[PDB]
């Protein structure tokens, strides 16, 4: 089964969202500033490609409109999302849970039902004291299967 590298400097996959012109290599988590400096990365260090919900975080940087997840808001309901691993191209469609604040604006959409999903997180303003990206917006995509 698809495995995420132990070496944090090695690419684990590729994520693409055509409608938003996003094409990025995905690195192992957790998503710290160093990891996001490398590219978008898995949310948690213990993430698994066999999980029902796979989370990937990406930066928002206005100096570079098409950098990582800066242009993710351009991906509306129904937008195709491609997650490429070594042996498969997984396809997902953006749901109505998009561009929403992590808490109270939106929550568990399919984390338990309706199948496999990808949770894309735009991250900004990392707080070293708490280990949290204070500025976050989530986008949930469900597998086309």
């Amino acid at each position: 089964k698809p495995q995420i590298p132990k070496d944090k400097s090695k690419v684990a996959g590729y994520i693409e969202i055509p409608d938003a012109d996003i094409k990025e290599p995905v690195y192992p988590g957790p998503a710290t500033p160093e990891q996001l400096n490398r590219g978008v990365s898995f949310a948690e260090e213990n993430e698994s490609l066999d999980d029902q919900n796979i989370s990937i975080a990406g930066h928002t940087f206005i100096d570079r409109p098409n950098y990582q997840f800066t242009n993710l808001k351009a991906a509306k309901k129904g937008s195709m999302v491609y997650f490429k691993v070594g042996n498969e191209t997984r396809k997902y469609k953006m749901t109505s849970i998009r561009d929403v604040k992590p808490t109270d604006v939106g929550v568990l959409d399919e984390q338990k039902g309706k199948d496999k999903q990808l949770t894309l997180i735009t991250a900004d303003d990392y707080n070293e004291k708490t280990g949290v990206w204070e500025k976050r917006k989530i986008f949930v995509a469900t597998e086309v299967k």
Partner: peptide, 5 residues
């Protein structure tokens, strides 16, 4: 949880 980054 939804998650964080």
């Amino acid at each position: 949880l939804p998650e964080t980054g």
